[PDB]
Amino acid sequence: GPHMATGQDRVVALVDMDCFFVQVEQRQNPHLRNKPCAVVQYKSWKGGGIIAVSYEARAFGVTRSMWADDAKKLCPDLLLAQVRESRGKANLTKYREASVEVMEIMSRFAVIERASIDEAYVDLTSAVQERLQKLQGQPISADLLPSTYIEGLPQGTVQKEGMRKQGLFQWLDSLQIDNLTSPDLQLTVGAVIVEEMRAAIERETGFQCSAGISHNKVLAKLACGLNKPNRQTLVSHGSVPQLFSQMPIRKIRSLGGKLGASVIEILGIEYMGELTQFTESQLQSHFGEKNGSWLYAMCRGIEHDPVKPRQLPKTIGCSKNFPGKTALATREQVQWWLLQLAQELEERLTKDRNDNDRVATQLVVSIRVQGDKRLSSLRRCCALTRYDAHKMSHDAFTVIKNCNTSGTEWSPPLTMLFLCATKFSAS
DNA sequence: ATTTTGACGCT
DNA sequence: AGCGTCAA
Ligand SMILES: Nc1ncnc2c1ncn2[C@H]1C[C@H](O)[C@@H](COP(=O)(O)NP(=O)(O)OP(=O)(O)O)O1
Ligand SMILES: [Mg+2]
Ligand SMILES: [Mg+2]
Numbered sequence: 001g002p003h004m005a006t007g008q009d010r011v012v013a014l015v016d017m018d019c020f021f022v023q024v025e026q027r028q029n030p031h032l033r034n035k036p037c038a039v040v041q042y043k044s045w046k047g048g049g050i051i052a053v054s055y056e057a058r059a060f061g062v063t064r065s066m067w068a069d070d071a072k073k074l075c076p077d078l079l080l081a082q083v084r085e086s087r088g089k090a091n092l093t094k095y096r097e098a099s100v101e102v103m104e105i106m107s108r109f110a111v112i113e114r115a116s117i118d119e120a121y122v123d124l125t126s127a128v129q130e131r132l133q134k135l136q137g138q139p140i141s142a143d144l145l146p147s148t149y150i151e152g153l154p155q156g157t158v159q160k161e162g163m164r165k166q167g168l169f170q171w172l173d174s175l176q177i178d179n180l181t182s183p184d185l186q187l188t189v190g191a192v193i194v195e196e197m198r199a200a201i202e203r204e205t206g207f208q209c210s211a212g213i214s215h216n217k218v219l220a221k222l223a224c225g226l227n228k229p230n231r232q233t234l235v236s237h238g239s240v241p242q243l244f245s246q247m248p249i250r251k252i253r254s255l256g257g258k259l260g261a262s263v264i265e266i267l268g269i270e271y272m273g274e275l276t277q278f279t280e281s282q283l284q285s286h287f288g289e290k291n292g293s294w295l296y297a298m299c300r301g302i303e304h305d306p307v308k309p310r311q312l313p314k315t316i317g318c319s320k321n322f323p324g325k326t327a328l329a330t331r332e333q334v335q336w337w338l339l340q341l342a343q344e345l346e347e348r349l350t351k352d353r354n355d356n357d358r359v360a361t362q363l364v365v366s367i368r369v370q371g372d373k374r375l376s377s378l379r380r381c382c383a384l385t386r387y388d389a390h391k392m393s394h395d396a397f398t399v400i401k402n403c404n405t406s407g408t409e410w411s412p413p414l415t416m417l418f419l420c421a422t423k424f425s426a427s
Numbered sequence: 428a429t430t431t432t433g434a435c436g437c438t
Numbered sequence: 439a440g441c442g443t444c445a446a
Binding site: 041042045046047050051064065066067083089090093114115116117169259290314315316317318320321323324325326416418420 | 428429430431432433434435
């Protein structure tokens with residue numbers, strides 16, 4: 001009772017851009033706005049591969065990883081924007097730069113953890129304390145939460161905005177605004193700040209986003225997706241038993257792969273809430289000490305992973321697949337594509353050094369061989385001493401060249417090349 | 428022929 | 439170090 005931790009110490013938000021690459025292209029090209037639209041990479045093979053889909057297009061069944069030719073069968077009027085191609089490969093610079101726009105706005109409000117190209121976690125605990133001091137017991141108006149859903153409410157009129165407002169009203173009517181240590185009040189103030197953040201993002205970039213507000217990263221991430229697009233969702237500690245009672249295990253971040261499948265198989269359960277019926281030692285016995293403790297706390301809504309102070313990526317990488325009959329089968333091919341990758345990498349590294357006062361010191365070279373189901377077949381490192389594309393490509397070849405069984409020829413043919421600059425030091 | 432990334436874990 | 443997992 002009085003010594004049971006409840007995981008209510010922090011206010012954490014997750015902000016994730018809505019159909020991000022599509023919005024970047026729609027800002028640039030007004031003809032694409034408010035249309036069924038997708039972003040594709042490459043075009044020769046089946047029209048290209050879709051990597052982002054507007055919500056209008058999702059209504060037709062268009063999804064990521066679909067070939068555009070196949071998406072056009074579902075949505076004949078689908079509009080397409082193509083990823084830039086430079087040096088023979090897709091180049092994501094436009095979206096990285098748009099990401100920086102958004103991350104720099106968010107960083108004005110609080111320390112952020114860049115979690116992907118289009119999302120960041122925010123630790124709002126201190127900002128909420130400050131705002132609560134400023135508010136001096138004044139109640140929080142629903143007008144301050146115009147796009148917020150309270151998960152689990154209303155409980156106890158047939159249109160969606162009416163439901164949202166009814167739930168928000170029940171929540172606010174129940175708040176105890178005279179207790180500055182109240183976790184529910186802290187989350188509510190967090191949601192007010194996130195409304196302000198999302199308004200600033202939209203005003204200053206044109207991009208819309210969704211957000212989750214809760215007490216930790218996992219719940220914030222889960223909350224964000226509950227009411228996408230262009231809305232934010234507050235998941236309180238008290239909402240967790242009902243929310244988790246029908247929540248498939250695979251929906252929780254880090255449980256969407258083999259571990260989550262093993263939880264389901266070994267324990268014979270389906271939903272996150274069912275995990276509460278195992279001891280911490282039972283869970284550690286099946287899934288290891290770290291995983292077992294994490295699962296024991298997480299199924300009760302408790303997680304302690306900190307929002308890390310890091311808004312810049314830790315690595316800068318360049319990769320290209322060579323599928324099917326395009327797999328590289330000659331030495332000259334391997335060297336030419338290593339040079340293309342190294343030239344893009346040099347451009348990005350030079351910009352990074354100027355912008356961010358740091359230098360990479362290690363070059364990682366990865367390759368996939370034809371037939372291997374693993375993303376990487378072989379990874380080798382060497383020193384990155386000069387931002388020089390010819391030197392980087394020559395070193396990468398030196399480091400991988402003895403994987404060739406025999407040849408001028410390369411066997412088995414290479415289905416992927418990957419260069420990654422790592423181990424940054426201040427400069 | 429689901430591509431191009433990027434973080435973190437294990438041994 | 440090099441390989442594996444999970445993820446957007
Ligand atoms: N598997 C993949 N391969 C390549 N790029 C990918 C990708 N998954 C995502 N991207 C790129 C393209 C995506 O636009 C961007 C952000 O990914 P999301 O946040 O998962 N999806 P979005 O923002 O589009 O939609 P919403 O969040 O509203 O559901 O990252
Ligand atoms: Mg997104
Ligand atoms: Mg995302």
